[PDB]
Enzyme design. Sequence first.
Site, PDB file in Angstrom:
ATOM      1  CG  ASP A 191      21.890  55.019   5.736  1.00  0.00           C
ATOM      2  OD1 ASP A 191      21.572  55.227   6.932  1.00  0.00           O
ATOM      3  OD2 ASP A 191      21.047  55.024   4.813  1.00  0.00           O
ATOM      4  CD  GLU A 234      18.636  29.134  20.208  1.00  0.00           C
ATOM      5  OE1 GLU A 234      18.402  28.521  21.288  1.00  0.00           O
ATOM      6  OE2 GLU A 234      17.903  29.001  19.195  1.00  0.00           O
TER       7      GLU A 234
HETATM    8  C1  LIG Z   1      12.186  57.385   4.843  1.00  0.00           C
HETATM    9  O1  LIG Z   1      13.111  56.483   5.368  1.00  0.00           O
HETATM   10  C2  LIG Z   1      14.134  55.697   4.794  1.00  0.00           C
HETATM   11  C3  LIG Z   1      13.869  54.994   3.535  1.00  0.00           C
HETATM   12  O2  LIG Z   1      12.766  55.094   2.978  1.00  0.00           O
HETATM   13  C4  LIG Z   1      14.922  54.176   2.933  1.00  0.00           C
HETATM   14  C5  LIG Z   1      14.548  53.483   1.618  1.00  0.00           C
HETATM   15  C6  LIG Z   1      16.157  54.055   3.538  1.00  0.00           C
HETATM   16  C7  LIG Z   1      17.339  53.190   2.931  1.00  0.00           C
HETATM   17  C8  LIG Z   1      17.370  51.765   3.344  1.00  0.00           C
HETATM   18  C9  LIG Z   1      16.851  50.684   2.645  1.00  0.00           C
HETATM   19  C10 LIG Z   1      16.140  50.879   1.285  1.00  0.00           C
HETATM   20  C11 LIG Z   1      16.906  49.206   3.096  1.00  0.00           C
HETATM   21  C12 LIG Z   1      16.243  48.254   2.091  1.00  0.00           C
HETATM   22  C13 LIG Z   1      16.574  46.833   2.058  1.00  0.00           C
HETATM   23  C14 LIG Z   1      15.943  45.768   1.433  1.00  0.00           C
HETATM   24  C15 LIG Z   1      14.661  45.938   0.588  1.00  0.00           C
HETATM   25  C16 LIG Z   1      16.404  44.305   1.482  1.00  0.00           C
HETATM   26  C17 LIG Z   1      15.560  43.225   0.819  1.00  0.00           C
HETATM   27  C18 LIG Z   1      16.212  41.924   0.857  1.00  0.00           C
HETATM   28  C19 LIG Z   1      16.782  41.004  -0.014  1.00  0.00           C
HETATM   29  C20 LIG Z   1      17.368  39.713   0.575  1.00  0.00           C
HETATM   30  C21 LIG Z   1      16.907  41.124  -1.556  1.00  0.00           C
HETATM   31  C22 LIG Z   1      16.863  39.848  -2.411  1.00  0.00           C
HETATM   32  C23 LIG Z   1      18.181  39.330  -2.840  1.00  0.00           C
HETATM   33  C24 LIG Z   1      18.594  38.350  -3.740  1.00  0.00           C
HETATM   34  C25 LIG Z   1      17.654  37.485  -4.588  1.00  0.00           C
HETATM   35  C26 LIG Z   1      20.070  38.004  -4.008  1.00  0.00           C
HETATM   36  C27 LIG Z   1      20.707  36.836  -3.274  1.00  0.00           C
HETATM   37  C28 LIG Z   1      21.201  35.842  -4.226  1.00  0.00           C
HETATM   38  C29 LIG Z   1      22.246  35.819  -5.147  1.00  0.00           C
HETATM   39  C30 LIG Z   1      23.222  36.980  -5.391  1.00  0.00           C
HETATM   40  C31 LIG Z   1      22.568  34.618  -6.061  1.00  0.00           C
HETATM   41  C32 LIG Z   1      23.757  33.767  -5.605  1.00  0.00           C
HETATM   42  C33 LIG Z   1      24.045  32.629  -6.499  1.00  0.00           C
HETATM   43  C34 LIG Z   1      24.998  32.385  -7.494  1.00  0.00           C
HETATM   44  C35 LIG Z   1      25.108  31.096  -8.310  1.00  0.00           C
HETATM   45  C36 LIG Z   1      26.080  33.365  -7.924  1.00  0.00           C
HETATM   46  C37 LIG Z   1      16.401  54.762   4.789  1.00  0.00           C
HETATM   47  O3  LIG Z   1      17.503  54.662   5.337  1.00  0.00           O
HETATM   48  C38 LIG Z   1      15.352  55.579   5.395  1.00  0.00           C
HETATM   49  O4  LIG Z   1      15.677  56.209   6.577  1.00  0.00           O
HETATM   50  C39 LIG Z   1      16.828  56.981   6.846  1.00  0.00           C
HETATM   51  C1  LIG Z   2       7.610  25.453  11.631  1.00  0.00           C
HETATM   52  C2  LIG Z   2       7.914  26.398  12.778  1.00  0.00           C
HETATM   53  C3  LIG Z   2       7.660  26.114  14.081  1.00  0.00           C
HETATM   54  C4  LIG Z   2       7.053  24.825  14.598  1.00  0.00           C
HETATM   55  C5  LIG Z   2       7.933  26.984  15.224  1.00  0.00           C
HETATM   56  C6  LIG Z   2       8.100  28.327  15.188  1.00  0.00           C
HETATM   57  C7  LIG Z   2       7.640  29.251  16.233  1.00  0.00           C
HETATM   58  C8  LIG Z   2       8.085  29.336  17.513  1.00  0.00           C
HETATM   59  C9  LIG Z   2       8.614  30.597  18.189  1.00  0.00           C
HETATM   60  O1  LIG Z   2       8.355  31.935  17.910  1.00  0.00           O
HETATM   61  C10 LIG Z   2       8.087  32.215  16.603  1.00  0.00           C
HETATM   62  C11 LIG Z   2       9.607  30.276  19.337  1.00  0.00           C
HETATM   63  C12 LIG Z   2      11.014  30.374  18.767  1.00  0.00           C
HETATM   64  C13 LIG Z   2       9.410  31.201  20.651  1.00  0.00           C
HETATM   65  O2  LIG Z   2       8.655  32.314  20.434  1.00  0.00           O
HETATM   66  C14 LIG Z   2       7.712  32.477  21.401  1.00  0.00           C
HETATM   67  C15 LIG Z   2      10.800  31.580  21.202  1.00  0.00           C
HETATM   68  C16 LIG Z   2      10.772  32.793  22.132  1.00  0.00           C
HETATM   69  C17 LIG Z   2      11.378  30.344  21.895  1.00  0.00           C
HETATM   70  C18 LIG Z   2      11.802  30.525  23.287  1.00  0.00           C
HETATM   71  C19 LIG Z   2      12.403  29.286  23.886  1.00  0.00           C
HETATM   72  O3  LIG Z   2      13.558  28.859  23.270  1.00  0.00           O
HETATM   73  C20 LIG Z   2      14.238  27.760  23.712  1.00  0.00           C
HETATM   74  C21 LIG Z   2      15.413  27.347  23.076  1.00  0.00           C
HETATM   75  O4  LIG Z   2      15.881  28.006  22.008  1.00  0.00           O
HETATM   76  C22 LIG Z   2      16.104  26.217  23.558  1.00  0.00           C
HETATM   77  O5  LIG Z   2      17.274  25.827  22.893  1.00  0.00           O
HETATM   78  C23 LIG Z   2      18.137  25.001  23.589  1.00  0.00           C
HETATM   79  C24 LIG Z   2      15.647  25.485  24.695  1.00  0.00           C
HETATM   80  C25 LIG Z   2      14.487  25.864  25.347  1.00  0.00           C
HETATM   81  O6  LIG Z   2      14.027  25.164  26.455  1.00  0.00           O
HETATM   82  C26 LIG Z   2      14.987  24.810  27.376  1.00  0.00           C
HETATM   83  C27 LIG Z   2      13.722  27.021  24.887  1.00  0.00           C
HETATM   84  C28 LIG Z   2      12.460  27.480  25.536  1.00  0.00           C
HETATM   85  O7  LIG Z   2      11.959  26.902  26.515  1.00  0.00           O
HETATM   86  C29 LIG Z   2      11.851  28.654  24.954  1.00  0.00           C
HETATM   87  C30 LIG Z   2      10.569  29.163  25.596  1.00  0.00           C
END
Ligand SMILES: COc1c(O)c(C)c(C/C=C(\C)CC/C=C(\C)CC/C=C(/C)CC/C=C(\C)CC/C=C(\C)CCC=C(C)C)c(O)c1OC
Ligand SMILES: C/C=C(C)/C=C/C=C/C(OC)[C@@H](C)[C@H](OC)[C@@H](C)CCc1oc2c(O)c(OC)cc(OC)c2c(=O)c1C
EC number: 7.1.1.8
Lengths: 125, 55, 62, 385, 93, 246
Positions: D229, D272
């Site tokens: 990985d 986008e």
């Molecule tokens: C059987 O198959 C597997 C398999 O099971 C696994 C586990 C893996 C390994 C991969 C993973 C386990 C990926 C897992 C990832 C996640 C669960 C991500 C979850 C997401 C998060 C965002 C975690 C939450 C994070 C936070 C709260 C921290 C962010 C904030 C911070 C550090 C604070 C900042 C602030 C200050 C003031 C310092 C494999 O690759 C795989 O196939 C090969």
């Molecule tokens: C609180 C949350 C709310 C209300 C909404 C969330 C859910 C909505 C969606 O999916 C989850 C939605 C993103 C959708 O999914 C079908 C995407 C494929 C959007 C596709 C999309 O994009 C555009 C875009 O980006 C633009 O930018 C400049 C301009 C656009 O017109 C010109 C579009 C547009 O015409 C379409 C169809």
Amino acid sequence: QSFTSIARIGDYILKSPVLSKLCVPVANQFINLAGYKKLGLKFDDLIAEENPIMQTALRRLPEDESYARAYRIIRAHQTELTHHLLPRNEWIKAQEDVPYLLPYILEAEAAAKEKDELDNIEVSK
Amino acid sequence: SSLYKTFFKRNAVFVGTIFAGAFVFQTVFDTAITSWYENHNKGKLWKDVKARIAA
Amino acid sequence: KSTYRTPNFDDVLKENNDADKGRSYAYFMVGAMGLLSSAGAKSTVETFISSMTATADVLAMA
Amino acid sequence: MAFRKSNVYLSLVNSYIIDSPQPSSINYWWNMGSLLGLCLVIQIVTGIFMAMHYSSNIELAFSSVEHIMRDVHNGYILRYLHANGASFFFMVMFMHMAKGLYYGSYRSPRVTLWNVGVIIFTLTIATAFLGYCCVYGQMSHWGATVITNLFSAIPFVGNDIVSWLWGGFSVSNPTIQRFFALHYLVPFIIAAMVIMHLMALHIHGSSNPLGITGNLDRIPMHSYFIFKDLVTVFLFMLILALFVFYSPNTLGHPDNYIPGNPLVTPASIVPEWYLLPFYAILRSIPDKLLGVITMFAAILVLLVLPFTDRSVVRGNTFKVLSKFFFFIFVFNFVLLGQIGACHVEVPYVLMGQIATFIYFAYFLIIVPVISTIENVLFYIGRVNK
Amino acid sequence: GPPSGKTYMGWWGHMGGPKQKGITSYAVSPYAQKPLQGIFHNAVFNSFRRFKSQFLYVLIPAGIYWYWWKNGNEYNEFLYSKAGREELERVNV
Amino acid sequence: MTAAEHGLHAPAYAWSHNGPFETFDHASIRRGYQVYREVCAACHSLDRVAWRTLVGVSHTNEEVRNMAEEFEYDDEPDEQGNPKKRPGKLSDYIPGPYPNEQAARAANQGALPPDLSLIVKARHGGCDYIFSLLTGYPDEPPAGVALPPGSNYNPYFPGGSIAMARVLFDDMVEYEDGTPATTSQMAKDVTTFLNWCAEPEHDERKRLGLKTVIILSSLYLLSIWVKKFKWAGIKTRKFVFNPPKP
Ligand SMILES: COc1c(O)c(C)c(C/C=C(\C)CC/C=C(\C)CC/C=C(/C)CC/C=C(\C)CC/C=C(\C)CCC=C(C)C)c(O)c1OC
Ligand SMILES: C/C=C(C)/C=C/C=C/C(OC)[C@@H](C)[C@H](OC)[C@@H](C)CCc1oc2c(O)c(OC)cc(OC)c2c(=O)c1C
Ligand code: HEM
Ligand code: HEM
Ligand code: HEM
Ligand SMILES: CCCCCCCCCCCO[C@@H]1O[C@H](CO)[C@@H](O[C@H]2O[C@H](CO)[C@@H](O)[C@H](O)[C@H]2O)[C@H](O)[C@H]1O
């Protein structure tokens, strides 16, 4: 798609000399392009096993064939991971690529279908 | 390579030595890059422009 | 075939004249990876930590 | 037993990352999942640090982002990582999904795994849209306008839903402030969904490129795949770095460097890039209601695959016709994207309508027909009676 | 603990596969192996093989789509030039 | 869509800042500022640029202070509450020519000169576009083009009809460093200056990128090697099957 269904269609084609001469050559070419034989596998080794029919079938398979399937599968994974094919002399020949598990599968599907029929049989007085 | 066996002798490099070497690397590497960068852009920098100015 | 007759590994095995050849290379690689990672992590952490220091626009000399 | 196995918290780590039995033959296509977790982390960390300097008021949103770009130490790095990271998050997700499509990962017994993945995909798209609106550039305002309007197509209450989503007569202050609040929330719901995704993955384990059982030869996650990985993690970071430092705006739109204007929609408006194929699908239907229904259906149709794939074998590795049509599907998807980036003009309109048909026909017609034919071909090519 | 549902994968010692017998495996320590440099001369001509079988499945659908794209684009360019303004009025509305 | 409506594609000039290892040319930035001050500033604001950012980039701490003081800004009310002005300081932002949008439109036939702080990033073509636009005004529009009153023709602008007339003419500025102030030279300079306004982190960003890419590349190559080593036993593993007797 059940194997009973694949057999129905397949046998209908195999019996008719019209289709039999038209399709088989195509099928034979399809099988060679598939490439599973270059990994040392037989088609039946490729059937997805995570279902009750296939588990019943694999359970009923005689020992010798079971150990053989195990070796072929393990050998295929190792070759796949090395990104190679087996030496040509080790490939599975068409004579060997026999549907060895098919009869067990068909038998299990029939048994299963009958249970489903009997559990739902209506009665008329 | 016998060059490795003189410093670490068949054993892997330990965390402490790794961390220590990292602090050293950071400083050295930065100066080396900044030097090359500023030299490659000689004439375009503000340092160079200020030299051609007098007020 | 007899299990006592080990298959050929000649193509993979190194003609052992320098016993710790593969070990020294592996440990240098592992060691260098550990070094550059630690420096990278340190730089990443400092980048984020410094984003919280006084912004360029708030350092007014009254 | 070892502590890693006895401790209540460590055992989770052990069963998921250390001793987890992996099929010996999984290839680099199985590295995308870890890359997705990494992407989730990069988005969350960079977003929280930026949130510290961001103002959601419609009068200050755009300038607050310029403030992050100019005055915050390393601010441009945080913003460019977040923006480019969102794009990388989609590139990797498409590959992760395409891998599933090709190897029959959506098949039984991994249906639940696949369904949860579809939900994550929808949530991720919604999260990115909410974030895009926070910049409050020209594309932000009109994107928010167009997308919230998608709901006006709902009969009777549609316009009410829109005014409720907006918090007023049009996309204004209430709108941007609630979109920022929601943008902060969803990533955590996605995190919870990822855990549910990993839970379903754990009970049956990963599949492999051969499409058959992996039970006869497993190797521990720890060491082998941890380091494997690592290889793609660095390659991923290297490429992301090239964009962040050398070409930070190549994947964005220049109009988003212009503050939003409620009275003018740029003629250059383009969604986008990761949303283009879906946009093209909607644009191909000359009806408001049907346009939005067909677009949403383009996502939900992914749920149909476990039922329309009639094959008796998992995956396309040994299937000549399925491999061919899979690539027809992939390139057809890229075309939809290229059409989305084009003007609503003559050759393009028809091409988009045909590509849209091909998109749906793949799941509903091609796969069931082709898989059935392949089933039969496999049979008659070896049965001698 | 609480009863767990039956799956198609167990754990070390009870993976759920069939009973194995007769298969013997051999391996050699990575430490005793020739340090990474031999993946050439012996492993180079052998490589690139796993794309010589696949490139057609990728190339043909790619070709079909690239051609279709090029054609429609060049046609659009013609329609919006002086020479094609006549055809434009015809195919437009 | 027609070529006129799309606008002429801007060609690629050899900017000294193009290239991964290239910094801005700071002398050009310095000159660009003068062109902005003496020509552009009459109609274009530069709201996002603070005086202090010029120091160490194109001007000295002293030069910027003098420039800022030439402008008056609102100060805090006196002891009695009445408003009062104040000369500019380094913490202030470069002031614009108009007090509000309405006043800006009135002075330009109803058109609105956009702020140029981000102009380089807010247009496809970047520097190539801005430069080409400034040096691309033909003395007379192509035959048949009915140009609206108060408008001007420029092939690089979408639709060809632009509300800004040509403003750069040879020697209209006296470069402090003696450089010949030709139109193409002045255009080359403001554009470079405007790129810096929009991307002030440019030079530093590329320097960090260089270190980041070198470390990551090494880590990548290194991980490949480590992975192959950790996998050697599995990759070269060999199996043998001896069918069990009944
Ligand atoms: C059987 O198959 C597997 C398999 O099971 C696994 C586990 C893996 C390994 C991969 C993973 C386990 C990926 C897992 C990832 C996640 C669960 C991500 C979850 C997401 C998060 C965002 C975690 C939450 C994070 C936070 C709260 C921290 C962010 C904030 C911070 C550090 C604070 C900042 C602030 C200050 C003031 C310092 C494999 O690759 C795989 O196939 C090969
Ligand atoms: C609180 C949350 C709310 C209300 C909404 C969330 C859910 C909505 C969606 O999916 C989850 C939605 C993103 C959708 O999914 C079908 C995407 C494929 C959007 C596709 C999309 O994009 C555009 C875009 O980006 C633009 O930018 C400049 C301009 C656009 O017109 C010109 C579009 C547009 O015409 C379409 C169809
Ligand atoms: C998977 C999660 C996320 C994704 C896909 C994502 C995506 C995005 C996108 C597409 C943008 C606009 C980028 C641009 O400027 O062009 C954005 C902006 C923003 N995001 Fe996120 N985001 C995520 C998580 C978060 C989180 C948890 C926070 C925490 C507050 C956050 C805070 C912000 C802020 C402050 C902005 C405005 C600054 C900017 O424009 O970059 N984001 N996000
Ligand atoms: C943030 C998003 C996601 C994360 C973190 C994630 C993570 C993972 C991980 C770690 C794996 C195991 C390794 C691998 O096969 O790559 C996995 C497997 C899988 N995921 Fe995801 N995933 C995400 C989104 C999705 C989506 C959007 C889908 C499908 C619509 C999906 C479908 C699957 C399937 C079917 C598998 C099993 C693959 C197989 O074993 O053949 N995932 N995922
Ligand atoms: C060399 C100094 C100048 C530079 C660098 C410059 C640059 C620009 C640029 C890049 C635009 C945007 C065009 C677009 O939308 O793509 C523009 C528009 C405009 N400029 Fe200037 N300008 C300069 C001097 C002037 C002066 C002195 C005036 C006032 C007499 C002026 C009036 C305008 C107006 C009215 C527009 C609006 C164009 C439209 O909407 O059609 N500019 N300028
Ligand atoms: C996520 C942020 C990144 C943080 C930094 C990354 C981690 C760096 C770790 C660096 C050194 O960690 C170091 O690893 C080597 C093995 O490779 C350990 O070595 C141990 O195993 C090796 C190999 O069998 C033995 O030769 C050695 O005698 C033994 O002590 C060493 O005791 C430990 O200290």
